[PDB]
Design a protein around this ligand. Structure first.
Ligand SMILES: OC[C@H]1O[C@@H](O[C@H]2[C@H](O)[C@@H](O)[C@H](O[C@H]3[C@H](O)[C@@H](O)[C@H](O[C@H]4[C@H](O)[C@@H](O)[C@H](O)O[C@@H]4CO)O[C@@H]3CO)O[C@@H]2CO)[C@H](O)[C@@H](O)[C@@H]1O
Ligand SMILES: *[C@@H]1O[C@H](CO)[C@@H](O)[C@H](O)[C@H]1NC(C)=O
Ligand SMILES: [Cl-]
Ligand SMILES: [Cu+2]
Length: 235
């Protein structure tokens, strides 16, 4: 159970974005129905009034929270991977438009899931803004919590993989457009009961054997990280 508070650009807090530049849901309940329109940008998908200004090569940091900003972020039980997708705001999330910029499941070294490191990062994880066409974009941050993903929602509607999905409105101003954005996958649509990483038992199976859902990270992606970039408590 977790939501996005707002974003930092190159370590600069852009302020509360909820229902302003984040298409926020009315609460932190997970999305579980893989076929639902709710898979696109969560249960409250509509153009909100603002879009954050960035340029190619900027560091965009999502900040998540549980009850209050900079609290415990997400329950320690919600072990899982973290992904970030981009689509043209054009699409409004519809069609084969979602392009993956970032994937992080399990770090063998530290033996932490992405979600574990997000809690440590005070809810902060980042992507470097790719060199796509200047214009208006949605950045879709997705946390998959697997604490009940041993079942499928379609077979047992009180269990299943849990999706914490937040779409940010981002306007890319300066970019040489050296990596034009290809077509991508639909949400709903890319995840089905058979897709790897959707049904998995973190209780019986080792986290090294975990394989996050497709698609693969676009070669145009400039990577990212899970780690605090700024102090919310100084505001
Ligand atoms: O831990 C292994 C065990 O986990 C079982 O699943 C547990 C989760 O572990 C636990 O974290 C989860 O707690 C939920 C709780 O159900 C929610 O109702 C509550 O929702 C609150 C919310 O947190 C508030 O922020 C908001 O204001 O109000 C809502 C509405 O009440 O959020 C917490 C997590 O933050 O509960 C699960 C029980 O199903 C697995 O079932 C089991 O298989 C595992 O072995
Ligand atoms: C999942 O969402 C689809 C499309 O909105 C809907 O028809 C279906 O009834 C939902 N499944 C459940 C269990 O509600
Ligand atoms: Cl839960
Ligand atoms: Cu939860």
């Amino acid at each position: 159970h977790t939501l996005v508070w707002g974003v930092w650009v190159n370590g600069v807090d852009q302020g509360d974005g909820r229902n302003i530049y984040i298409r926020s849901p009315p609460n932190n309940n997970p999305v579980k129905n893989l076929t639902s329109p709710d898979m696109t940008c969560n249960v409250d998908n509509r153009v909100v009034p603002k879009s954050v200004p960035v340029n190619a090569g900027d560091t965009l940091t999502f900040e998540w929270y549980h009850n209050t900003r900079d609290d415990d972020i997400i329950a320690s039980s919600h072990h899982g991977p973290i992904a970030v997708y981009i689509a043209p705001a054009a699409s409004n999330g519809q069609g084969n438009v979602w392009v993956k910029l970032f994937e992080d499941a399990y770090n063998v070294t530290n033996s932490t899931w992405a979600v574990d490191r997000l809690i440590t990062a005070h809810g902060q994880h980042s992507v470097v803004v790719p060199h796509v066409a200047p214009g208006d974009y949605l950045f879709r941050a997705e946390i998959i919590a697997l604490h009940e993903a041993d079942s499928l929602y379609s077979q047992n509607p009180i269990r299943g993989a849990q999706f914490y999905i937040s779409c940010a409105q981002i306007t890319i101003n300066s970019s040489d457009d050296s990596t034009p954005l290809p077509a991508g996958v639909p949400f709903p649509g890319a995840y089905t009961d058979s897709t790897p990483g959707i049904q998995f038992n973190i209780y019986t199976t080792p986290a090294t054997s975990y394989v996050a859902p497709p698609p693969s990270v676009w070669s145009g992606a400039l990577g990212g990280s899970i780690a605090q970039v700024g102090d919310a408590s100084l505001e």
